[PDB]
Design an enzyme around this catalytic site. Structure first.
Site, PDB file in Angstrom:
ATOM      1  N   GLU A   1       0.882  -1.325  -0.093  1.00 43.37           N
ATOM      2  CA  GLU A   1       0.026  -0.078   0.020  1.00 43.37           C
ATOM      3  C   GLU A   1       0.851   1.201   0.143  1.00 43.37           C
ATOM      4  O   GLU A   1       0.571   2.002  -0.837  1.00 43.37           O
ATOM      5  CB  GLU A   1      -0.848   0.180   1.311  1.00 43.37           C
TER       6      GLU A   1
ATOM      7  N   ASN B   1      -7.297   8.561  -5.468  1.00 46.30           N
ATOM      8  CA  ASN B   1      -8.067   7.578  -6.265  1.00 46.30           C
ATOM      9  C   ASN B   1      -8.614   8.072  -7.612  1.00 46.30           C
ATOM     10  O   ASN B   1      -8.735   9.424  -7.623  1.00 46.30           O
ATOM     11  CB  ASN B   1      -9.077   6.809  -5.271  1.00 46.30           C
TER      12      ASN B   1
ATOM     13  N   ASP C   1     -12.008   8.383  -8.229  1.00 47.33           N
ATOM     14  CA  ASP C   1     -13.251   8.864  -7.558  1.00 47.33           C
ATOM     15  C   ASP C   1     -12.901  10.100  -6.902  1.00 47.33           C
ATOM     16  O   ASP C   1     -14.062  10.868  -6.506  1.00 47.33           O
ATOM     17  CB  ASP C   1     -13.957   7.983  -6.878  1.00 47.33           C
TER      18      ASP C   1
ATOM     19  N   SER D   1     -11.159  10.757  -4.092  1.00 45.98           N
ATOM     20  CA  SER D   1     -10.852  10.700  -2.665  1.00 45.98           C
ATOM     21  C   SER D   1      -9.278  10.187  -2.817  1.00 45.98           C
ATOM     22  O   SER D   1      -8.646  10.053  -3.875  1.00 45.98           O
ATOM     23  CB  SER D   1     -11.675   9.646  -2.084  1.00 45.98           C
TER      24      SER D   1
ATOM     25  N   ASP E   1      -5.863   8.165  -0.815  1.00 43.81           N
ATOM     26  CA  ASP E   1      -5.539   7.123   0.327  1.00 43.81           C
ATOM     27  C   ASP E   1      -4.378   7.570   1.170  1.00 43.81           C
ATOM     28  O   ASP E   1      -3.417   8.371   0.638  1.00 43.81           O
ATOM     29  CB  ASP E   1      -5.148   5.866  -0.203  1.00 43.81           C
TER      30      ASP E   1
ATOM     31  N   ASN F   1      -8.753   5.266   2.950  1.00 42.13           N
ATOM     32  CA  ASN F   1      -9.289   6.293   2.065  1.00 42.13           C
ATOM     33  C   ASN F   1     -10.031   7.254   2.753  1.00 42.13           C
ATOM     34  O   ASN F   1     -10.494   7.275   3.953  1.00 42.13           O
ATOM     35  CB  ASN F   1     -10.535   5.476   1.269  1.00 42.13           C
TER      36      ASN F   1
ATOM     37  N   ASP G   1     -15.327  -3.819   9.259  1.00 40.97           N
ATOM     38  CA  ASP G   1     -16.437  -3.254   8.631  1.00 40.97           C
ATOM     39  C   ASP G   1     -17.247  -4.184   8.021  1.00 40.97           C
ATOM     40  O   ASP G   1     -18.599  -4.140   7.782  1.00 40.97           O
ATOM     41  CB  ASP G   1     -16.194  -2.152   7.542  1.00 40.97           C
TER      42      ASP G   1
END
Length: 128
Positions: free
Chosen positions: A35, A46, A48, A50, A52, A59, A101
């Site tokens: 990562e 990212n 979209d 957003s 990281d 995120n 989650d």
């Protein structure tokens, strides 16, 4: 901060990641390797919109606020910058929320693709 392999392993163990939600310490180090490359200041935007953040590329749409991600949830209730400190406490505390989650470490696209099913033992090799 660019963590050493064993350096992050002991840092992650101390903070409560070893076998957190059944995920051995190796899975987290492995994840943090693919990562952020053990770099705490890692930031990846990212597609979209957003971004990281940190050692585990958390995120900003769901977990932290960077003020530039509409629909930002900030479920960990922290600024995304706090995920870039040399102290990985914030990143671990939030990772525990992420890995709980429901989808576990599948949330980390790198983990599922580069760690899941693999010999994650080898990431805590020679680590005292």
């Amino acid at each position: 901060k660019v963590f050493g392999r064993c350096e992050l392993a002991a840092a992650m163990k101390r903070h409560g990641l070893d076998n957190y939600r059944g995920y051995s310490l190796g899975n987290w180090v492995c994840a943090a390797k693919f990562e952020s490359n053990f770099n705490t200041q890692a930031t990846n935007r990212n597609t979209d919109g957003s971004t990281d953040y940190g050692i585990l590329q958390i995120n900003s749409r769901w977990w932290c606020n960077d003020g530039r991600t509409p629909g930002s949830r900030n479920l960990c209730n922290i600024p995304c910058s706090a995920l870039l400190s040399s102290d990985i406490t914030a990143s671990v505390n939030c990772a525990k929320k992420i890995v709980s989650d429901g989808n576990g470490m599948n949330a980390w696209v790198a983990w599922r693709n580069r760690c899941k099913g693999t010999d994650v033992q080898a990431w805590i090799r020679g680590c005292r």
